[PDB]
Amino acid sequence: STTEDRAKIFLDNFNHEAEDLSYQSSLASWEYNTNISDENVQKMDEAGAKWSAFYEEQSKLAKNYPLEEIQTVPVKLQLQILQQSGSPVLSEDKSKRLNSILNAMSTIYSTGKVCKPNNPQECFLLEPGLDNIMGTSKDYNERLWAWEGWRAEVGKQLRPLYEEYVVLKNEMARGYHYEDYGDYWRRDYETEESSGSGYSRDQLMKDVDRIFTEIKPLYEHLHAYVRTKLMDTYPFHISPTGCLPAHLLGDMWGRFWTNLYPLTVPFGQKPNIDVTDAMVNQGWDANRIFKEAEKFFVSVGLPNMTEGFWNNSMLTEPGDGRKVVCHPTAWDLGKGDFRIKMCTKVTMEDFLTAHHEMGHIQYDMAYATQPYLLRNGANEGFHEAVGEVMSLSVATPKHLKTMGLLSPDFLEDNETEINFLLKQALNIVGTLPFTYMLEKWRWMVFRGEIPKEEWMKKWWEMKRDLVGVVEPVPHDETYCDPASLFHVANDYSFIRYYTRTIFEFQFHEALCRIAQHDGPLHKCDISNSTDAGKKLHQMLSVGKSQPWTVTLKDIVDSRNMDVGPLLRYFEPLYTWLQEQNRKSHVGWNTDWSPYSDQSIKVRISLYEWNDNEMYLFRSSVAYAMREYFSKKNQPILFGVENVWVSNLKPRISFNFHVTSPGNVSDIIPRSEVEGAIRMSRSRINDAFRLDDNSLEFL
Amino acid sequence: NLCPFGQVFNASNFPSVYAWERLRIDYAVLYNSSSSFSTFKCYGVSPTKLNDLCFSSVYADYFVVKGDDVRQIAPAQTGVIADYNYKLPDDFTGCVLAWNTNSVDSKSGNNFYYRLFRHGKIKPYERDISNVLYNSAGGTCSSISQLGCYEPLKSYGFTPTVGVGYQPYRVVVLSFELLNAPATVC
Numbered sequence: 001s002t003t004e005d006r007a008k009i010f011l012d013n014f015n016h017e018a019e020d021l022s023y024q025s026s027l028a029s030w031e032y033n034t035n036i037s038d039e040n041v042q043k044m045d046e047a048g049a050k051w052s053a054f055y056e057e058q059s060k061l062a063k064n065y066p067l068e069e070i071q072t073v074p075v076k077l078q079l080q081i082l083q084q085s086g087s088p089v090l091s092e093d094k095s096k097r098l099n100s101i102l103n104a105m106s107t108i109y110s111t112g113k114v115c116k117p118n119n120p121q122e123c124f125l126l127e128p129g130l131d132n133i134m135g136t137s138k139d140y141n142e143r144l145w146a147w148e149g150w151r152a153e154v155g156k157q158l159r160p161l162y163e164e165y166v167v168l169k170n171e172m173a174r175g176y177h178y179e180d181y182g183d184y185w186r187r188d189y190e191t192e193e194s195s196g197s198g199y200s201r202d203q204l205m206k207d208v209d210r211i212f213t214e215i216k217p218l219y220e221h222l223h224a225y226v227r228t229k230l231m232d233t234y235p236f237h238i239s240p241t242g243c244l245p246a247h248l249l250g251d252m253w254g255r256f257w258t259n260l261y262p263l264t265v266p267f268g269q270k271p272n273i274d275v276t277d278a279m280v281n282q283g284w285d286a287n288r289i290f291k292e293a294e295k296f297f298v299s300v301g302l303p304n305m306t307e308g309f310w311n312n313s314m315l316t317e318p319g320d321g322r323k324v325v326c327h328p329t330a331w332d333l334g335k336g337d338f339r340i341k342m343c344t345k346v347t348m349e350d351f352l353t354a355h356h357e358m359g360h361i362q363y364d365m366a367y368a369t370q371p372y373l374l375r376n377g378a379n380e381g382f383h384e385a386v387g388e389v390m391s392l393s394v395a396t397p398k399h400l401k402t403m404g405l406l407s408p409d410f411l412e413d414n415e416t417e418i419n420f421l422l423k424q425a426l427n428i429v430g431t432l433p434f435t436y437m438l439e440k441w442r443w444m445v446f447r448g449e450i451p452k453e454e455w456m457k458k459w460w461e462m463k464r465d466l467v468g469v470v471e472p473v474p475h476d477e478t479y480c481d482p483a484s485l486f487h488v489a490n491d492y493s494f495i496r497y498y499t500r501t502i503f504e505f506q507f508h509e510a511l512c513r514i515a516q517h518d519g520p521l522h523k524c525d526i527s528n529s530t531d532a533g534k535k536l537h538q539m540l541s542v543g544k545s546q547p548w549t550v551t552l553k554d555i556v557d558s559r560n561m562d563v564g565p566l567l568r569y570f571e572p573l574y575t576w577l578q579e580q581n582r583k584s585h586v587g588w589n590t591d592w593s594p595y596s597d598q599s600i601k602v603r604i605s606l607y608e609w610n611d612n613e614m615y616l617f618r619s620s621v622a623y624a625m626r627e628y629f630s631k632k633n634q635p636i637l638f639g640v641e642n643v644w645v646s647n648l649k650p651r652i653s654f655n656f657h658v659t660s661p662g663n664v665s666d667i668i669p670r671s672e673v674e675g676a677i678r679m680s681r682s683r684i685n686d687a688f689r690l691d692d693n694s695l696e697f698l
Numbered sequence: 699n700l701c702p703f704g705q706v707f708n709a710s711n712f713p714s715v716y717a718w719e720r721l722r723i724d725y726a727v728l729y730n731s732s733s734s735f736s737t738f739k740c741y742g743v744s745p746t747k748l749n750d751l752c753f754s755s756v757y758a759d760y761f762v763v764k765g766d767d768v769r770q771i772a773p774a775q776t777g778v779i780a781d782y783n784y785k786l787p788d789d790f791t792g793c794v795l796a797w798n799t800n801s802v803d804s805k806s807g808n809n810f811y812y813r814l815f816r817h818g819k820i821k822p823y824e825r826d827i828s829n830v831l832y833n834s835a836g837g838t839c840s841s842i843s844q845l846g847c848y849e850p851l852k853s854y855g856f857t858p859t860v861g862v863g864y865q866p867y868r869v870v871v872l873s874f875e876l877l878n879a880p881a882t883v884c
């Protein structure tokens with residue numbers, strides 16, 4: 001009759017139909033994903049279309065029940081998941097423009113090709129060919145070419161699309177009674193319990209930049225050690241006290257440093273853990289891998305698999321001809337159906353990925369008794385944090401030695417621990433400042449603190465300041481370097497990896513304390529521990545039906561985010577790196593760049609300064625370079641694109657340097673450019689109508 | 699010679715839970731059955747030592763519920779099936795039998811239904827097959843494109859890949875009076 005006597009009937013009607021429509025949509029999506037063909041890509045637009053229409057129709061009807069005058073937490077929180085619409089408050093033209101923009105950025109990122117400066121008939125996509133060069137190549141010039149060919153043939157295409165995307169997303173999020181698109185991304189980590197003591201959207205930024213200040217010494221020591229080991233290779237290219245160049249970090253964006261492990265390996269004589277050969281030699285297959293993962297999950301007390309997991313979900317490459325994209329993922333189809341789609345091999349990393357995906361399944365199996373709107377992780381960090389923390393215990397060489405893969409004669413000295421911890425820190429510690437800096441840049445761009453004419457300037461300023469990474473060549477406002485990454489061009493939240501790492505190590509410390517582990521945290525196995533399984537399973541079942549702070553309190557005995565478990569995990573590595581970085585410099589200065597020593601400072605003493613005068617200056621510099629090299633019997637066609645401008649203060653001064661055409665690594669020496677300017681000093685400022693005192697050329 | 703207790707366990711089809719039927723109306727076929735039962739909960743009389751207190755009338759209510767809904771067919775239970783679909787008395791005597799039929803009742807393109815919405819709870823042994831739309835306030839809306847009116851009969855939506863808990867279960871409930879004896883069957 002009244003409110004709270006009809007909203008539960010509305011949610012009873014919603015759940016018992018949303019379950020069926022979501023199951024049909026998930027069945028169609030699985031049938032496409034394992035059987036990519038023409039007739040299977042057509043069936044999401046006949047099932048997901050009805051699911052989206054039903055979701056928006058029930059979201060419109062949910063607004064008739066106010067969030068006031070309802071007291072019980074689950075139905076009120078289900079109405080909170082509803083009411084907030086799946087139908088944006090945005091114009092039809094603006095919504096169509098936003099969809100076109102997102103499709104354009106996805107197409108440009110997916111089909112962007114970078115060609116070599118000499119013989120331009122071969123070009124490389126990002127995933128075939130450029131990621132290979134970013135991962136495996138130790139050549140400076142090839143890495144710089146692949147780093148600058150990207151973000152200039154692709155990022156320059158993504159700059160105005162990203163500007164209009166930012167405008168349209170801010171307009172869309174302001175219609176959801178938020179302030180920013182970054183604030184709308186922070187609709188997660190938003191709880192209310194009693195007396196206004198809940199977790200706010202603004203509390204997340206304070207928590208993350210407190211955690212970032214708490215990880216500063218460990219990351220600084222890791223950065224100093226990586227910089228020291230990046231001087232054995234690349235001599236005369238990395239400053240001992242400066243920042244690291246952006247193209248020497250193991251991939252395209254410097255996200256993960258784990259490809260720098262062969263260059264920065266400690267004790268290279270000691271072999272690392274690799275059970276792949278014993279995995280093949282014992283006749284293992286995919287079924288054995290997943291049965292051993294299920295045996296690991298049973299041993300802590302978590303249940304078996306649903307027996308439709310073994311039948312419906314594929315666990316190998318399909319022998320019959322069926323096109324599949326082979327990306328490990330775990331499927332929660334709904335209605336009690338759980339599946340894993342991955343093309344696993346007999347490999348140690350495939351073993352750990354199988355543990356990861358089965359951890360996702362076991363987290364999905366727990367909250368199946370919750371209502372459909374609350375069948376998710378309590379925040380966007382717990383789900384992947386559980387996934388990664390379930391694979392930490394089995395990667396240790398005591399769980400591997402129990403299964404028989406590792407020989408009992410393997411030496412577990414204190415050097416292999418340092419090798420494992422440094423590989424982990426390259427994977428884990430080296431990606432936290434990057435994640436924090438990228439999400440801070442996106443939050444300040446959406447908030448409006450970074451103007452549209454200072455996107456790249458602020459981006460590289462806080463990349464130098466926070467990450468400790470310097471650009472190898474200057475990028476003006478025509479570039480868009482964040483958009484060159486997948487998660488930025490495809491409109492994905494990115495702080496979930498930061499919170500994933502924090503919650504993963506917090507859960508690891510809690511479960512290892514519960515399981516009565518004695519030694520260090522990195523050598524901990526939570527296997528054969530029923531007590532850890534009980535405390536684990538009482539958190540997976542809650543789903544979102546409870547605030548994330550109070551379900552974090554029930555497992556780690558702290559409502560807030562803590563990084564103390566993470567610093568205790570890498571404590572032997574931290575005290576080893578303190579000893580290693582004793583005669584070296586720990587920290588960086590944001591003044592050094594690879595073009596810093598060969599750049600000429602120019603000061604302006606006033607006729608006016610538009611962007612049409614910068615082009616004139618660059619043309620005059622290029623013509624002076626051509627004239628100076630013409631008298632040296634070296635005909636080189638210097639252009640505007642070969643003159644780079646850095647430290648651009650549009651009122652007083654800027655820096656510039658000249659690069660040889662067809663070779664971005666070939667910076668012209670500073671004496672050559674100064675000699676060119678002195679030779680052609682008349683017609684480098686006769687067009688500007690100013691004497692040599694106005695442009696002093698320091 | 700003859701004891702009619704079959705033809706209700708080997709029937710080619712069962713109705714939905716809201717449309718259960720009875721029989722007017724041999725107990726060794728429960729143990730050595732064609733299908734091994736998943737639920738053998740018997741209340742009042744016991745399965746072992748059963749054919750000693752003879753009964754003059756036996757009712758066999760048969761229907762199909764969800765896998766998780768088998769728990770709700772028992773005396774003194776609260777649920778959607780108990781409140782709106784099928785109710786047992788608090789002093790019920792007899793056995794409740796169920797078995798999985800995912801290979802049979804979920805293969806076809808047919809549908810099984812259950813009354814999610816009703817105006818008040820249901821009495822024991824009361825059958826409700828009305829298709830009248832349910833309004834939250836009251837009365838008859840006669841318009842699904844409104845606010846507060848929903849379809850009462852919801853669908854189980856059986857698929858052979860749902861897994862245990864959402865799979866079809868054929869439930870046959872045997873109920874006895876334990877006090878009615880006009881000296882007919884003994």
Ligand SMILES: *[C@@H]1O[C@H](CO)[C@@H](O[C@@H]2O[C@H](CO)[C@@H](O)[C@H](O)[C@H]2NC(C)=O)[C@H](O)[C@H]1NC(C)=O
Pocket residue numbers: 035037038039040
């Ligand atoms: C993979 O997809 C193809 C179609 O993309 C499936 O082929 C269909 O199979 C059904 C089965 O009755 C037929 O009715 C259709 O006519 C077929 N379509 C085509 C285009 O051949 C195929 O069965 C799928 N395979 C699996 C294992 O799911």
Ligand SMILES: *[C@@H]1O[C@H](CO)[C@@H](O[C@@H]2O[C@H](CO)[C@@H](O)[C@H](O)[C@H]2NC(C)=O)[C@H](O)[C@H]1NC(C)=O
Pocket residue numbers: 299399402527528
């Ligand atoms: C978890 O405990 C079980 C039983 O305590 C272990 O299973 C046995 O472990 C012993 C010692 O390694 C072996 O000799 C046996 O072959 C194992 N299997 C049996 C008895 O069936 C199991 O290895 C333990 N697992 C972990 C990861 O500690």
Ligand SMILES: *[C@@H]1O[C@H](CO)[C@@H](O[C@@H]2O[C@H](CO)[C@@H](O)[C@H](O)[C@H]2NC(C)=O)[C@H](O)[C@H]1NC(C)=O
Pocket residue numbers: 141663665666667
């Ligand atoms: C492009 O420029 C780079 C760097 O100017 C050249 O690479 C070598 O760089 C070192 C010092 O950085 C010089 O001592 C070598 O003489 C350079 N050349 C070689 C072959 O090692 C590179 O050669 C230039 N050309 C191309 C096509 O990349």
Ligand SMILES: *[C@@H]1O[C@H](CO)[C@@H](O)[C@H](O)[C@H]1NC(C)=O
Pocket residue numbers: 298303304
């Ligand atoms: C899990 O499955 C194995 C074999 O399938 C069985 O031996 C074990 O008892 C099962 N455990 C649980 C908790 O169901």
Ligand SMILES: *[C@@H]1O[C@H](CO)[C@@H](O)[C@H](O)[C@H]1NC(C)=O
Pocket residue numbers: 414415418576
């Ligand atoms: C390992 O231990 C030995 C002796 O305890 C010590 O000399 C050595 O420095 C240690 N190495 C590391 C990497 O901790």
